[PDB]
């Protein structure tokens, strides 16, 4: 196989100029789409705040329009899903993972407007769900759309522009080019066999995406956490312990999401009307909570900087974790459109923060900042539930810019994946793609 | 399909034996890396103490500089030609080859040869990098524990071979991420599926890196400080720089390939002419290493000086040209040692130089030449080696200027794109190719 290799080695990294140029087009569109989705979600969150001020006096009246406003956007969001694109329910990452395995269709004439407007409903409603879901799926669909439209032939191209769309989609959601590129080549591409995905092409797509997000979102980070302290070698072992804690919690959380998926399916049975109604119910609870306890609802990015800063009481940190596990499960396992990726960042941060606080009081010889532990914890549920540690690590890095915590981040994440393996849990995105592929055979 | 459904449910279940064994490879590679590194510096130190003992007679001191290196160089080329020829050059093509199951991992021979061979050429003050030694030694250690413990399986032969080379790049740069990424972007078999456990390579890189940190904490290899940000209206300049690196990459690639041949003439393959040529080249490096230290050595000392704009335009043009020369000479001569880091110094100098032109041409941009230095620093890597992802994340891990991530990515990508469009190849892949073809011929 030697002579073939020599031929192959000499022909390496020669992506067809067509695919390279098209990567740039996919990037650019995904980016603008992502920017819009973001700007849309923000506008609805804002009109909702403008309603609570038009009725800021009558608390029971105000507690009502807080509920209804979400409920309507929730329902409308669930409705676009169940009626026109069932594949746009849930995250949007198993579905494009499916598409990379050539085992799920990319119906872009339906998913684009369903994911976009349906997500705009759930997120803009104030539900506990992340933009990644929508942007990744949207991005890949936009990937497919420019494939079809220019009728590019080849396996390389289909897989490439599909992958580029998802990577440009993740990048634009977090202002995280490296994490987008990495996510594809760690999680997203097909895991069990070879593929022809030009990394350089995913690259170009991602760049263009990130430049578009930059044209419209310059000067304000999603997460400013400032420059935290260092970690001395004698402190490293504590991070292993935090990893192990995520590691056994990872799989447990995974069960609750799959389990809740089932338990919630009972309530509506498949029925579009019960389902939509159950959507406005969960939706409204979030709009409500988003007023009376805003750290238990929404994206959770706001409470990231706070937990890292030490401005939360252990009691509040325990409250926020428990509550959010509850609302994360409700919002995602109910099948609304939207990711579960970003909400795992908040759950991560909170849990680590609290660990840091206990680490500070038990160990003053160490000179701890509980904030280093929050930051090692932020990508850690990503590690133990999604089993994409290399991506959560680089993603947290890009968002928090605390490179001195590298060793700490890597060790925590790693400890989490190891214990997630060892206690019999599985990558959450893969376990979802599976039940969906298996239902695509059970009813046959 | 039903195959897939059973695959997804079984995903990321690396055999515990492979995981525990990664820990030991990483540790052994970390230790070995450290030892290699302290060895090199010690010898570099001695040579500095010999120039002090004779610091009066200028033509005498020029001599003992030449000789101390010449001898060490000779001892280095010697250990390779005599006991382990697969430990000539960089060492990455070889391990790549190994992972393709097309080259042998003779660890009983490569470990001591690459270690002491590297010790000589590097410690003598030649323009080479510790990666070659450390990645090869690390892969070889990986095979070594695999043999010794008799681990059967393709996954085990491919994983432990990989975690060893990642751990050895991590340890030579204090870049745990770049270690990991180099495996997935460049080292792994590029044209077919492989069962290499990413989680396991990770573990090896952690243990490797920790070892290095036990013995090298509190000092970084490159400190550059915090540089300015890069305005959107400033981004197109980085595209241009990457274009410049993109056309030069392939040309420089030809030159390393050709100089390999043109030096292979001088000695014909003969151990004595070869080891002698070695001491001339090494002698030249210990000599330049005193009269103009910027033209010789690893190159790390001038990167901060270049980034802080503390060189003149002329002094940069010189240093660059001077290094193109002493880089080809040192590495195309077959001396044990990587070409990977000497590209970092090259990429930095070109950048700074481009940066300085930008400053005087566009005062409206409020530019800092150091930002082009950092964008360029991993750009030659992108152009010649064609691992832009590993380049970018490596420079990030060493320079800590993340606000330059767009400019760095843009320049690097403009580098790979133009390298491809001008017919250049992945230099590591071109070398493994050359070696596999000269095999079956
Ligand atoms: F998700
Ligand atoms: F090299």
Curated annotation (Swiss-Prot), chain A:
It comes from the Bacteria. Changing residue 187 to D/H: No effect on proton and chloride transport. Keywords: Antiport, Cell inner membrane, Cell membrane, Chloride, Ion transport, Membrane, Stress response, Transmembrane, Transmembrane helix, Transport. GO terms for molecular function: chloride:proton antiporter activity; identical protein binding; voltage-gated chloride channel activity. The record marks 132 as: Mediates proton transfer from the outer aqueous phase to the interior of the protein. Residues 54-60, 217-236, 294-313, 361-370 are periplasmic. Changing residue 187 to C/I/L/V: Abolishes proton and chloride transport. It catalyses: 2 chloride(in) + H(+)(out) = 2 chloride(out) + H(+)(in). The record marks 187 as: Mediates proton transfer from the protein to the inner aqueous phase. HAMAP family: CLC_ClcA (MF_01128). Proton-coupled chloride transporter. Functions as antiport system and exchanges two chloride ions for 1 proton. Probably acts as an electrical shunt for an outwardly-directed proton pump that is linked to amino acid decarboxylation, as part of the extreme acid resistance (XAR) response. This is H(+)/Cl(-) exchange transporter ClcA. The lineage of its organism: Bacteria, Pseudomonadati, Pseudomonadota, Gammaproteobacteria, Enterobacterales.
